[PDB]
Amino acid sequence: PGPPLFNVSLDVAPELRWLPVLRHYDVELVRAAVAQVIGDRVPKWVLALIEKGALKLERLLPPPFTAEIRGMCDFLNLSLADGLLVNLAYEYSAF
Amino acid sequence: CTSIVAQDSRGHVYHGRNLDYPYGSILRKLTVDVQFLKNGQIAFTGTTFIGYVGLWTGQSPHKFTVSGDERDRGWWWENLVAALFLRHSPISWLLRTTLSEAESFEAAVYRLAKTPLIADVYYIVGGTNPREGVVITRNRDGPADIWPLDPLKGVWFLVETNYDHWKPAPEEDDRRTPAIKALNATGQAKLSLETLFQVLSVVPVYNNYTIYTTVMSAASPDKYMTRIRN
Numbered sequence: 001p002g003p004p005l006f007n008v009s010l011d012v013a014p015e016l017r018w019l020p021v022l023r024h025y026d027v028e029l030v031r032a033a034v035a036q037v038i039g040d041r042v043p044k045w046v047l048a049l050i051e052k053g054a055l056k057l058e059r060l061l062p063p064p065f066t067a068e069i070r071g072m073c074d075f076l077n078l079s080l081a082d083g084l085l086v087n088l089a090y091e092y093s094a095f
Numbered sequence: 096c097t098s099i100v101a102q103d104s105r106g107h108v109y110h111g112r113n114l115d116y117p118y119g120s121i122l123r124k125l126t127v128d129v130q131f132l133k134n135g136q137i138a139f140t141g142t143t144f145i146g147y148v149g150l151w152t153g154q155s156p157h158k159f160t161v162s163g164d165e166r167d168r169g170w171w172w173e174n175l176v177a178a179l180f181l182r183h184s185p186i187s188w189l190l191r192t193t194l195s196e197a198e199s200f201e202a203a204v205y206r207l208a209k210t211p212l213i214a215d216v217y218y219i220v221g222g223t224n225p226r227e228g229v230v231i232t233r234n235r236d237g238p239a240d241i242w243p244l245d246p247l248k249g250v251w252f253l254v255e256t257n258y259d260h261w262k263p264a265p266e267e268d269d270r271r272t273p274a275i276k277a278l279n280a281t282g283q284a285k286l287s288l289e290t291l292f293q294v295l296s297v298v299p300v301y302n303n304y305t306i307y308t309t310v311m312s313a314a315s316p317d318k319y320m321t322r323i324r325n
């Protein structure tokens with residue numbers, strides 16, 4: 001039947017437009033899933049420094065790109081550093 | 096990854112891809128097809144993982160389809176400067192921005208070819224008219240090469256794995272040859288989303304790291320089909 005099919009309205013603010021989708025998912029499954037891939041690849045010394053520069057890093061990235069991640073993180077209780085790392089996985093050779 | 100844009104004997108363009116990455120046990124559960132709406136209407140469709148807002152596979156209905164494959168991503172300090180100092184775009188974010196803003200297959204190739212990026216990538220684009228099929232080998236600053244369909248010359252498909260097409264694939268990881276072999280046997284006459292799907296189901300094109308397979312045709316946007324593998 002293929003994967004789930006979801007609607008995302010680009011007329012809703014970036015922080016809010018992914019949240020109706022996240023309702024259908026176990027919040028703890030997603031958190032643990034992000035935590036596993038990040039912990040398996042990002043060195044612990046990199047994670048420490050990124051968590052301390054996550055707010056400065058967010059401001060230097062495309063606002064709409066980061067605004068959607070910020071909203072999903074608050075909803076999932078995920079750390080911004082974790083949301084940015086997984087969304088910049090391709091741009092980081094660790095992944 | 097493996098992306099294929101091809102044209103059949105009647106002038107129809109088909110576009111399919113295989114997304115290869117570890118952690119399939121996790122990501123298969125989080126794979127989703129997303130229809131992005133404007134004014135309540137489908138502006139474009141994409142396949143992604145819950146939590147990842149960029150699109151590596153997507154379709155602008157009746158305009159073009161696009162997929163992105165990994166290219167040598169260089170060093171992290173080059174990407175850092177390009178990202179934070181030069182303000183270049185993430186790869187999957189440009190791909191999704193193009194699906195949103197580009198008004199035609201031609202405009203999409205321009206955007207995907209010349210917009211500065213944080214790292215290298217292969218952009219594969221298909222359209223809704225004959226010959227509308229290219230592979231954009233991207234540098235950070237622009238296109239290293241553009242590779243078009245040429246049916247009258249005998250080039251009715253373009254097969255991109257993760258290596259430059261003007262060079263031979265590595266002996267250790269060659270999914271290009273079996274993909275070509277499977278396409279020649281299919282034939283430009285019998286090309287379709289189903290036969291295309293079977294090309295992408297051939298080993299090792301279909302390997303243990305394949306998470307999902309998508310086949311699409313911007314001219315028939317309702318045929319957009321993603322399937323979870325394994």
Ligand SMILES: CCS(=O)(=O)c1ccccc1C(=O)N1CCN(c2nc3ccc(F)cc3s2)C[C@@H]1C
Pocket residue numbers: 030031032033034035037086087089090091095096114115116121125144145146147151163164165
């Ligand atoms: C070129 C596309 S690719 O997926 O194969 C790839 C190859 C090498 C390095 C990075 C990436 C890449 O762009 N991604 C890989 C993993 N990813 C993930 N998204 C989530 C989302 C939730 C979660 F719990 C874990 C993950 S891992 C983001 C992106 C698709």
Ligand SMILES: COCCOCCOCCOc1ccc(C(C)(C)CC(C)(C)C)cc1
Pocket residue numbers: 013015016070071074075
């Ligand atoms: C900065 O606002 C963007 C403009 O929005 C116009 C439409 O109204 C949407 C604003 O609503 C919110 C409310 C809260 C939030 C945050 C990120 C603070 C928390 C959240 C998303 C978990 C509710 C974001 C957007």
Ligand SMILES: COCCOCCOCCOc1ccc(C(C)(C)CC(C)(C)C)cc1
Pocket residue numbers: 043046050057088091092093094171174175178213
């Ligand atoms: C396997 O080889 C990779 C080695 O990984 C360890 C080296 O990492 C050191 C620096 O790590 C980072 C991580 C993120 C970043 C940001 C998010 C600021 C930018 C990015 C994603 C473009 C690299 C910069 C440096």
Ligand SMILES: CC(C)(C)CC(C)(C)c1ccc(OCCOCCO)cc1
Pocket residue numbers: 172175176
């Ligand atoms: C963020 C920077 C790049 C500005 C500063 C830091 C100190 C992190 C830096 C500075 C320089 C640097 O060079 C890498 C070695 O190049 C040799 C070619 O192989 C790497 C990192």
Ligand SMILES: CC(C)(C)CC(C)(C)c1ccc(O)cc1
Pocket residue numbers: 046049050052053056057
């Ligand atoms: C290069 C280094 C890993 C040492 C620092 C990094 C990217 C985590 C950083 C730190 C602060 C900041 O504002 C942006 C990036």
Ligand SMILES: *[C@@H]1O[C@H](CO)[C@@H](O)[C@H](O)[C@H]1NC(C)=O
Pocket residue numbers: 077
């Ligand atoms: C969310 O994370 C915060 C840490 O910032 C923690 O204090 C809180 O207990 C968490 N809540 C849930 C429901 O996980």
Ligand SMILES: *[C@@H]1O[C@H](CO)[C@@H](O)[C@H](O)[C@H]1NC(C)=O
Pocket residue numbers: 005006007130132135136137
């Ligand atoms: C998405 O939106 C369209 C138009 O509003 C609607 O017809 C369709 O049923 C919606 N699909 C989902 C899964 O919400």
Ligand SMILES: [K+]
Pocket residue numbers: 022023024025026027
């Ligand atoms: K829930």
